[PDB]
Known about the structure:
With about 230 residues, the protein is of the alpha/beta class. The chain has 10 helices and 6 strands.
Amino acid sequence: MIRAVFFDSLGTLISVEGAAKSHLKIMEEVLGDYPLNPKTLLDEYEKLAREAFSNYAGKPYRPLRDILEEVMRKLAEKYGFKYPENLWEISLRMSQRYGELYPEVVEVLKSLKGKYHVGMITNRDTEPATAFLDALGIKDLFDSITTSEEAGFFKPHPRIFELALKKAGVKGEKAVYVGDNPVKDAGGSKNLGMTSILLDRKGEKREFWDKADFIVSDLREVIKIVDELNG
Ligand SMILES: [Ca+2]
C-alpha cells in the first residue's frame, strides 16, 4: 500500500521559469549601472551553480548561502564589479517576489490530503525553503518538509530520504518520490524501496526514463498512479 507521496522542489512544485526570472532580477540588482549585460552574468552564474550542484550532490551538507557567496565572489572578481553586500537578503527578497508554483500544484496537494502523507524533500536550507512555501501560501498543505540541513546530506544520499520516511512513519516500499532530476537526485530513494516517478514536463529526458518506475508530464497524473498501485 502506498501511504506517502513526496515531492522534489525546483522543477517539480516550484517553477524553473520563476526561478530564472528571480535570478535575472538578482543579477540586475547586483550590477546596478555596471556595464555588463545581466543576462550574460546570469548565464555565467548558472554555469557555476550547476558545477556546484554537481560537486555537492550526495555529499555532507554545506549551507547554500556559503556556496552562493563563493560563486558570486568569483564573478565579481572576474568582471570587476563590487561584490554585493547583503547578497543573501537580496536573493531571499527576489525569490519570494518572483517565485511561482506550477499551475496544477495546489490542486494536486489538496487532492492527496487526508489520504496520503504529503511531503517535500529539498536540498535547500530549512528556513528559506519553509519561508518560500509560506510566501506562496502552501506551507500548511504539507505533512512534512525535509531538508538537507536536517538530514546532514544532500540528495541523492539516502539519509535525507530515510528522514522523510521516518517522519511519515513508513518504510520506503509504502512511498512514492516525484521529481524532475533523473541523475543526482532520486538514487537514494530507490535504495530505500521507494517508487520513483520522473516528472518530464517537456518530454526532454527520454534517455533517462529507464532510471524511473513511472514517467509523467503533469503532477495530476501522480494520484492516478498511486490509486492504481493501491487498487
Ligand atoms: Ca528538481
